[PDB]
Input
Amino acid sequence: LDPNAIITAGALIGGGLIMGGGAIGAGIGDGIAGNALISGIARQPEAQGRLFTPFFITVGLVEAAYFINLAFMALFVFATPGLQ
Amino acid sequence: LDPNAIITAGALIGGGLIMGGGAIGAGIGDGIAGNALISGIARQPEAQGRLFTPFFITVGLVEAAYFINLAFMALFVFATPGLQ
Amino acid sequence: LDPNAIITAGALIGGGLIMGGGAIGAGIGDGIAGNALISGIARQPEAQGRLFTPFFITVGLVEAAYFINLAFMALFVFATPGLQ
Amino acid sequence: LDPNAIITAGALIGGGLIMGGGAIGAGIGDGIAGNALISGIARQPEAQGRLFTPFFITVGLVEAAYFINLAFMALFVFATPGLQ
Amino acid sequence: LDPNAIITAGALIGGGLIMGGGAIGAGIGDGIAGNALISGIARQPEAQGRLFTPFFITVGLVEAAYFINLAFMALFVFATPGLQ
Amino acid sequence: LDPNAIITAGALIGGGLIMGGGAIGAGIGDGIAGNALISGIARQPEAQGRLFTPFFITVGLVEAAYFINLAFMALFVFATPGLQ
Amino acid sequence: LDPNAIITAGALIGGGLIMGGGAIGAGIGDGIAGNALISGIARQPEAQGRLFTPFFITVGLVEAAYFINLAFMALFVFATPGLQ
Amino acid sequence: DLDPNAIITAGALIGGGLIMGGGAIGAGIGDGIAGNALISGIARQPEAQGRLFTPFFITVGLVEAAYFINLAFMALFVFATPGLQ
Amino acid sequence: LDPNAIITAGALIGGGLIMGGGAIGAGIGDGIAGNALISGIARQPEAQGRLFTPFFITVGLVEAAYFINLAFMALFVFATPGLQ
Amino acid sequence: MSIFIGQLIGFAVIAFIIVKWVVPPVRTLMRNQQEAVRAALAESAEAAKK
Amino acid sequence: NFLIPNGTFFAVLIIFLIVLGVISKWVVPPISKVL
Amino acid sequence: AIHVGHHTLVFELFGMTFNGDTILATAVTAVIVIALAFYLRAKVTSTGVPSGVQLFWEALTIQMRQQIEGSIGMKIAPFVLPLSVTIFVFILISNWLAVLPLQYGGADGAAAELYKAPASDINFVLALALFVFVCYHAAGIWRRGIVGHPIKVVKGHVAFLAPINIVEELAKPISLALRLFGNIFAGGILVALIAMFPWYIQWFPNAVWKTFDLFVGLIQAFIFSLLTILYFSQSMEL
Amino acid sequence: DLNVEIVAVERELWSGPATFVFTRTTAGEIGILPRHIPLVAQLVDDAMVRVEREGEDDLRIAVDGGFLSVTEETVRILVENAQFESEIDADAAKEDAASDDERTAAWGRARLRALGQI
Output
């Protein structure tokens, strides 16, 4: 019964899972890193100068888990593997 | 059973997942960043001005991710890929 | 099977996910921002007058996301895209 | 298959999701606010009363949020949108 | 396939979600409140009697939601809404 | 394609949700309570005698939620409601 | 399709959810209890000797949960209830 | 007829996916928390790093154990799928 | 219906699950480790190199789990076991 | 080409925002650095003369 | 598909190399000397 | 329709396909970088007041040198200073040029772009990541020996976690590429979605998105540069 | 009951059993009960101390340079200067409040808080 229909339905479900998990992870990680940054800046002003270096690194390590997954989402939704 | 019906159902499910994950991530990241900002303002009132800067960076990331989800869900429902 | 039946079932499931994620994010973020505000009040009661300014901003956006999700859920269960 | 059967099954699963997310959010937020209140009282017992007014806000804003889900679940399982 | 079979399967899924969310929320809230109570008791043992006044509220307000879920679970799994 | 088969599959999925949510909540709550206890004992090696009480209360609440979920999952799988 | 086929599909999915929840709970709880133990050892090196006492108990109360879930996988997979 | 073997395969694959999702969430977050504790300890006590390795790894050990256990079970689901006809 | 279509749809959904869980875990773990690193930097400006190594160990474990998920999802999708 | 008009209007809005808010502070930073290096050069010449 | 690597993999790489040459012989050493 | 993954000027040489759009974008970015470099070199003043271009270049160099020195000995790894910095500027330009209003209609309603950031092409990010991977692995070989360097990396910080270290190494290159890819790929897709709206509705969301995408691109170039320096420092020790 | 002992640099100000001690450290307000865990905190620059004792109205003490130290059985507040409520002048604190010197302002505000004017 139109197998490609089931293929694309499964692909859409998979991409939804991709985006949901990635968004949850990115939001939580970025919020935690921002909390760390704000607390550190509250501890002393000058420290801000050196805080953005590790902080961005953290963000760099966080957003990756999102955007990596984001790529796969496209691979799932546009160039669906095993689409027949 | 027209296949496009199954495609649209799967796309709606995927959009639901995307919004669920985006909402969870955005809400919790906002909560954490705001907790940091509120604690900082409580402890050092004179830090108020210098605290809104990093905070809006954190939000600038968190909310951004949410917006990305908001877009892709639309692509799922209003421009369902592979609908054919 | 009537295709519209599958369409509306999928849309209603998606709305269910949207509510679930929005409620999770709203509750967790609002609770975290609260915890912050209560800690500020207990530690430094004088801060109370100035604590509503950041807190309501924080919570102010926390609801926004959630409320935004709510809107789209109404789109899902009342104006289901692709409905026939 | 009766269309209303699958539509109502989807509605029930959606309501299950709605309450699952609402209960998760309410539990997390209420627990976090309670932790804040308990810690504040432990640090300054006589502050107990003063902390109820802030506390009741966040709880009154977290629990309240969850309650919206309940209402909508009725619309999902008692007057189901698009119920043929 | 009998439509009532699909209805009951959807109802069981919904109730499973009810309990998943409710148990997660209740467990996490109890853990967080207990962490706060244990920290307070360690800090101010003589305040124990006072610290139980808010604690029972928070638990009394967390478990409440969980029990509320239980209620509607029955309505899902015993008197299925929309059943034919 | 017996209706009993569909109902049993739905019941199994629901019970799986019961157990998954209960296990997540129980594990995280127990971990948090144990973290509180460990910190208290490390700071005050002589306080374990009075710390065990609130820790036991928290563990009791968490395990009560977990075992209620266990009982309801058993109700699902072994005596499926609605099954004909 | 054979009824046992869908029965076993549902059983597999339910067992997968059970293990997912158990793994989440165990990992999170033991990570938090660890954090506690490492912090205590950092503050009180010698206290290590006594800190292992509560820690194990915490791990127990977490690990037990996971193992219990493990058992039910068998009860769900190797001996699926309701199979015909 | 729907070729029940396909139904079993799909169910087993979804179960393995759920097992991996839970296991990865638990392992990643637990390792992150333990590493947070280790980093804070080393920051507070620069000379305690070695003393901190002994507990840290222990905790991490058990964390990874759960993940690995899940891994094992997934190998049963996808390849040696139980309930196959 | 095509058995291959069902098998590959299940494979895509399972891969989406794998990646969603991996992304959540990786993002949250990286965020927490980065919070620890940023707090350490704020406290001690000169501990930069010293705090690299343990933060890199933690991030290494987290990303190792994430990319184990990536490899297993690639196996699931591109070379699906049980694909007949 | 309606989308072309829309994206052109968007770019115009972006450029207006940039010129209104971002350009002035960065121009001030560049001026501060240029003045600092010029003052360092003048002070070095004065020190050599001294 | 889009994620599949293509031949342009090399071409872009080549360009990057020459950029290095411009930055390793006309930008960075002079700037280090200036500082 | 959106038609993700589309390309133009796709041709073949030596029995291998080439994406003309990516080549053109990379060539334009490299030309801009080289023009800036030569403008600086012609008007570089060690004694007089420096021009804005000199301020920009010296700020980039100072930042990169500061991170290099902090992570590792600056004297130990001079070659890292150029590589790192160039990457930054390269990626930065590769992203910021996307702000220019080059979105039009392809006669089917699908948005078409004269210039798409090469990062949206997997080949660009893969080339950059593999280049940096090879560079710092070779540097590790140089500073630890042909056989010692693999031994140290597999041993890692702690020996009995050798398996993870393997994955750790394999995590470094791909993580560097895909991350960047996504950060731009989204944008490459995202603008197209707004292009579905009419002009009087397309102007606003596109404006906001591109205003934020400027910051996203700058942050991503910075992240990639610091991560490259960090991996270089990791692979060259003892 | 816990043995509170407010001690100045020049002498010992006051001592005795009490039921509760409310003060304000750098982190924030704090309350000390009979079995509070050991603590060493710096009182805020303009700190005030309220001691609640059995069968007697709460003692309000304006403190300068306070340093609270809580032990298993004692609470000691190390005050570079102190003033009981009976000895504080509302007019003096009000007039000298918010002067050109921060320490003077802190002492005046501590006097005001002890008086309860706030």
In short: Chain K is about 70% helix and 0% strand.
